[PDB]
Amino acid sequence: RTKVFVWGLNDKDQLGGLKGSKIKVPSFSETLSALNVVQVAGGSKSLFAVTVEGKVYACGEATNGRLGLGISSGTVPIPRQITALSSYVVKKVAVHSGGRHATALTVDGKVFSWGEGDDGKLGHFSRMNCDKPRLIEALKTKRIRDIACGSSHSAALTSSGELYTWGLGEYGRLGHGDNTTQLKPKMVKVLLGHRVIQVACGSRDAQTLALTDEGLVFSWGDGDFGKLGRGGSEGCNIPQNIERLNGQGVCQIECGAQFSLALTKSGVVWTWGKGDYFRLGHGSDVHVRKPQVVEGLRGKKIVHVAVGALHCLAVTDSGQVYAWGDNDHGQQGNGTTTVNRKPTLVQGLEGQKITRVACGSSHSVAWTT
């Protein structure tokens, strides 16, 4: 049995069945707890749930076909099954906190995409929206082990460790040495010879992050606010090693809105990028142009992290959830709409051994296993 708790913005019912638009305290989700979830993922005013059974459920704003339910205009107030995938066992849904398209990865390695088609980010050689999931044919001969989506581009990595990117080319986020939009998955040739094991994608003028099995972190794309982590603000269209993180044992990477986050095997959280509204967790709202340890979590072993647009969640090994960043809609879970300038214990979860967290644009999720 997996208990799921949700909070934050709920104007399009992206929290799946609660009353009120600003849920300021984590709230037990009856609908999502009943599904037996292995993953919850949050997009722009949207929530997706992958179950142990391998089904996918979606709720929230339906505009641009972002929920994959065969519609494109209203809201879906209660989690509904994406019945287009009911013949598959889905392992993971990838969606950006500010995104309107998503991908799903099956246990047998197939990738499906749906939602907003702009700039080719769905990977079907076109810019057309897909109101329902569609198999990415270009990946059919490839055994995908992981997926990620930004707001304007997408990525996938093979079991052998090759990285593919597609979607909007502008500002170098795809990593192919130019700024050209790619309407179909394209291998990142620079990283051949590294086994890439994880990738994260940003939004708007976006960065991309990748992690190798040697613990090397690479970044490319838009340079604004230092979110590439090599100082200053210059973008690049070629993957570059973030030297600061070498030897740190990074095991998880994420991209929020204009910022980047890494978690290490020893439990340390690093953040860098745009500082506005305290999304970085360092206590001030200044930008940070090379990775810096989140000092407010020092001595707390973090085992999982999630980023929204302007907020972050981190889970300790004892099941406690810390949040920092913006709180216009209650997504900090501190009972108010006051920003958390430093990581702050979320209320309402004591006795719930949280194992994983998730965020969407302005909303937050915690669940047990």
Binding site: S21, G98, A309
Partner: peptide, 10 residues
């Protein structure tokens, strides 16, 4: 206004 902030449409 931050471009990545949601508006509460309720």
């Amino acid at each position: 206004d931050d471009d990545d902030k949601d508006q509460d449409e309720s």
